[PDB]
Design an enzyme around this catalytic site. Structure first.
Site, PDB file in Angstrom:
ATOM      1  N   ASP A  96       0.825  -1.203   0.000  1.00 29.11           N
ATOM      2  CA  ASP A  96       0.000   0.000   0.000  1.00 29.11           C
ATOM      3  C   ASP A  96       0.853   1.243   0.000  1.00 29.11           C
ATOM      4  O   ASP A  96       1.972   1.283   0.458  1.00 29.11           O
ATOM      5  CB  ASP A  96      -0.969   0.004   1.185  1.00 29.11           C
ATOM      6  CG  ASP A  96      -1.874  -1.219   1.278  1.00 29.11           C
ATOM      7  OD1 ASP A  96      -2.230  -1.861   0.296  1.00 29.11           O
ATOM      8  OD2 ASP A  96      -2.321  -1.484   2.422  1.00 29.11           O
ATOM      9  N   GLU A 140     -13.914  -0.976   5.257  1.00 28.64           N
ATOM     10  CA  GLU A 140     -14.393  -1.091   3.880  1.00 28.64           C
ATOM     11  C   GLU A 140     -15.797  -1.691   3.908  1.00 28.64           C
ATOM     12  O   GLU A 140     -16.164  -2.492   4.769  1.00 28.64           O
ATOM     13  CB  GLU A 140     -13.463  -1.973   3.080  1.00 28.64           C
ATOM     14  CG  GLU A 140     -12.048  -1.433   2.917  1.00 28.64           C
ATOM     15  CD  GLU A 140     -11.052  -2.442   2.497  1.00 28.64           C
ATOM     16  OE1 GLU A 140     -11.278  -3.644   2.807  1.00 28.64           O
ATOM     17  OE2 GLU A 140     -10.009  -2.047   1.910  1.00 28.64           O
TER      18      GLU A 140
HETATM   19  C1  SIA Z   1      -5.730   3.153   1.405  1.00 31.08           C
HETATM   20  C2  SIA Z   1      -5.329   1.743   1.789  1.00 31.08           C
HETATM   21  O1  SIA Z   1      -4.292   1.597   2.514  1.00 31.08           O
HETATM   22  N1  SIA Z   1      -6.072   0.796   1.374  1.00 31.08           N
HETATM   23  C3  SIA Z   1      -5.730  -0.614   1.679  1.00 31.08           C
HETATM   24  C4  SIA Z   1      -6.520  -1.147   2.913  1.00 31.08           C
HETATM   25  C5  SIA Z   1      -6.196  -0.342   4.177  1.00 31.08           C
HETATM   26  O2  SIA Z   1      -4.800  -0.295   4.512  1.00 31.08           O
HETATM   27  C6  SIA Z   1      -6.926  -0.911   5.407  1.00 31.08           C
HETATM   28  O3  SIA Z   1      -8.326  -1.072   5.072  1.00 31.08           O
HETATM   29  C7  SIA Z   1      -6.673   0.003   6.598  1.00 31.08           C
HETATM   30  O4  SIA Z   1      -7.333  -0.554   7.744  1.00 31.08           O
HETATM   31  O5  SIA Z   1      -6.212  -2.522   3.235  1.00 31.08           O
HETATM   32  C8  SIA Z   1      -5.543  -3.325   2.272  1.00 31.08           C
HETATM   33  O6  SIA Z   1      -4.153  -3.242   2.808  1.00 31.08           O
HETATM   34  C9  SIA Z   1      -5.800  -4.796   2.710  1.00 31.08           C
HETATM   35  O7  SIA Z   1      -6.266  -5.115   3.963  1.00 31.08           O
HETATM   36  O8  SIA Z   1      -5.511  -5.735   1.938  1.00 31.08           O
HETATM   37  C10 SIA Z   1      -5.666  -2.949   0.833  1.00 31.08           C
HETATM   38  C11 SIA Z   1      -6.154  -1.495   0.519  1.00 31.08           C
HETATM   39  O9  SIA Z   1      -5.594  -0.996  -0.738  1.00 31.08           O
END
Ligand code: SIA
Ligand code: CA
Ligand code: CA
Length: 448
Positions: free
Chosen positions: A49, A297
Site C-alpha cells: 500500500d 471497507e
Molecule cells: C488506502 C489503503 O491503505 N487501502 C488498503 C486497505 C487499508 O490499509 C486498510 O483497510 C486500513 O485498515 O487494506 C488493504 O491493505 C488490505 O487489507 O488488503 C488494501 C487497501 O488498498
C-alpha cells in the site's frame, strides 16, 4: 451439473500488463450499454500500500460480455510515489455517465500517516486547496491560480493533475517530494467520469472540500462499486461506500452520495454515529477510541422499498450489516452481526440481483469464507422481511441459501457484477498482488 457455467479463470491483470509488475484491488461493473469495465490498482513497485509504492489506476473494457477484453489504459498516474489507491465504479442511468472514484495521496502519505482534515481552506465562502512552502507558509489555489496568505497573486498556477507552473512553465507537481509548493499530506477523494462508455475519462476532480470533515485523518473509497437508488424518495441518488479514521485513528464506514448526477457530494453519518453496541453503550465515529467496534471497507445494496444495507468489514470475525431508512444520510443504531457469514477482516463484494431466486429478492455476495484470506465463496442471499422496527419500517435479514466455493486457497479482495445474460461476473485477488482473475458463473452452477 449439465448446463452449469464456471469459466476457467483468465488473468485479466497480471505482471507485465501495461508494464506494471503488480496489481491489486478489483472493481467490476456492467454499464447500461452492456460493457464490462474492470478497474484496478497498477502497483508499480510491488504489492505494498501507499506510501510504499507508486500506484496508478488501470482500466480494461469488454464489449462482448467478458469474453474478450481491450488492451487497457492508465487513467490516473501521479509522479514520484504519489499514489491513487482503491477504485470504485458506478453509473448515472439517466445521463449515461460512468464514474470512477479513488483515494489519492501525495508522495510519502498513506492510510497510517494522513494528516487531519480536507486540505482546503475557506476564503470568503469558497473552499480552496492549500499549498505549503518550505517554511510552512500557506497559499491557496483559486481557480488554478496560487495566492499567498495576503491574497496576493503569485507566479504559480496549477492544473487538475497537480502540475505546478511558474509563469506558464511546468516546474514540478504539488504531489511530488520536490515541489516548492506542496499539497497537505493527507488523503483526497478523486472523481473521474466517462461519457463514452468507458473509452475516455476526465481528469480528476478533488471532492475533499465537500466530503471530508476537519476531524477526519484518512477518508478513502471503499473499493468495488457503488449503487444508484432505484426505489422511493431517494431514487436517482448515487451512493459510494467510503470509510474514515478519526483523530484517534479508529475506523468507521459511511457513504458519500450525490443527488445531482455527480456534480455535488455529501458524506452521510457512519453506522458508528450513535451506534448502540450489544449491551447498550452508545458510541460515535468522532470519539471512537477502541478497536473492537471499528467498521471499515464496505459495499451497499438496496432493499425492495429503497432501504439501504451496508455490508461492512469489521473486527468481529463475522459480517456486519447496517440499515439506512433515509438514503444513506443516517443509519439505524443496531449493526447486525450475521454469524452465518465469516469475515476475516477483508474487503467483500455484494450486489443486488435483478431476478428473484426461489420466489425471493436476492443479493450475490463474495468474500473469503474463512478466518484467513482463503476459501473464496460466492453466495446467494434471499431477502426476508423478519418484522418491523419501532418506527414501522420493514426489517430485512438474509437467508444465505446457496454458498459455493469458487477459489480454493488464496482469496482476498473481489468484485461482482451481474451480466447481460443474467449470469455473474467476478474479478478476484486469487494471488496477493500478481494475477487478478476473472470468471463467469451462472446460477445453475451457484445453486448446485
Ligand atoms: C488506502 C489503503 O491503505 N487501502 C488498503 C486497505 C487499508 O490499509 C486498510 O483497510 C486500513 O485498515 O487494506 C488493504 O491493505 C488490505 O487489507 O488488503 C488494501 C487497501 O488498498
Ligand atoms: Ca505514478
Ligand atoms: Ca445512528
Amino acid at each position: 451439473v449439465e448446463g452449469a457455467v464456471k469459466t476457467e479463470p483468465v488473468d485479466l491483470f497480471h505482471p507485465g500488463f501495461l508494464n506494471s509488475s503488480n496489481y491489486r484491488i478489483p472493481a467490476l461493473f456492467k454499464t447500461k450499454e452492456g460493457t464490462l469495465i474492470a478497474s484496478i490498482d497498477a502497483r508499480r513497485h510491488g504489492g505494498a500500500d501507499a506510501p510504499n509504492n507508486d500506484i496508478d489506476t488501470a482500466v480494461r473494457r469488454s464489449e462482448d460480455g467478458g469474453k474478450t477484453w481491450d488492451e487497457g489504459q492508465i487513467i490516473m498516474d501521479y509522479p514520484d510515489k504519489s499514489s491513487v489507491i482503491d477504485t470504485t465504479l458506478i453509473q448515472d442511468d439517466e445521463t449515461g455517465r460512468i464514474f470512477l472514484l479513488v483515494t489519492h495521496f501525495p508522495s510519502k502519505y498513506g492510510f497510517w500517516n494522513a494528516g487531519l482534515g480536507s486540505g482546503f481552506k475557506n476564503i470568503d465562502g469558497k473552499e480552496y486547496l492549500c499549498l505549503y512552502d518550505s517554511s510552512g507558509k500557506e497559499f491557496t489555489v483559486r481557480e488554478n491560480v496560487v495566492y499567498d496568505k495576503d491574497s496576493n497573486k503569485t507566479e504559480y498556477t496549477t492544473n487538475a493533475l497537480g502540475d505546478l507552473f511558474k509563469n506558464g512553465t511546468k516546474i514540478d507537481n504539488i504531489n511530488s517530494s520536490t515541489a516548492p509548493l506542496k499539497a497537505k499530506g493527507t488523503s483526497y477523494i478523486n472523481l473521474v467520469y466517462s461519457d463514452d462508455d468507458g473509452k475516455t475519462w476526465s481528469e480528476p476532480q478533488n471532492i475533499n472540500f465537500q466530503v471530508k470533515k476537519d476531524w477526519m485523518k484518512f477518508l478513502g473509497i471503499a473499493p468495488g462499486r457503488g449503487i444508484q437508488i432505484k426505489n422511493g424518495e431517494h431514487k436517482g441518488r448515487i451512493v459510494v461506500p467510503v470509510y474514515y479514521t478519526n483523530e484517534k485513528g479508529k475506523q468507521s464506514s459511511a457513504v458519500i452520495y450525490s443527488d445531482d448526477s455527480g456534480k455535488n457530494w455529501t458524506i452521510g453519518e457512519s453506522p458508528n454515529d450513535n451506534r448502540k453496541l450489544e449491551n447498550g453503550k452508545i458510541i460515535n465515529s468522532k470519539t471512537l477510541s477502541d478497536d473492537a467496534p471499528q467498521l471499515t471497507e464496505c459495499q451497499v445494496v438496496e432493499m425492495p422499498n429503497g432501504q439501504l444495507k451496508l455490508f461492512m468489514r469489521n473486527l468481529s470475525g463475522y459480517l456486519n450489516i447496517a440499515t439506512s431508512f433515509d438514503g444513506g444520510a443516517t443509519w439505524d443504531e443496531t449493526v447486525e452481526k450475521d454469524t452465518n457469514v465469516l469475515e476475516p477482516y477483508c474487503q467483500l463484494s455484494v450486489i443486488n440481483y435483478s431476478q428473484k431466486v426461489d420466489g425471493k429478492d436476492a443479493v450475490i455476495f463474495s468474500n473469503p469464507n474463512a478466518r484467513s484470506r482463503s476459501n473464496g465463496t460466492v453466495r446467494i442471499g434471499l431477502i426476508n422481511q423478519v418484522g418491523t422496527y419501532e418506527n414501522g419500517e420493514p426489517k430485512y435479514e438474509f437467508d444465505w441459501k446457496y454458498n459455493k466455493l469458487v477459489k480454493p486457497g488464496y482469496y482476498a479482495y473481489s468484485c461482482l457484477t451481474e451480466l447481460s445474460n443474467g449470469n455473474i461476473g467476478l474479478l478476484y485477488e486469487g494471488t496477493p498482488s500478481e494475477e487478478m482473475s476473472y470468471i463467469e458463473m451462472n446460477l445453475k452452477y451457484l445453486e448446485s
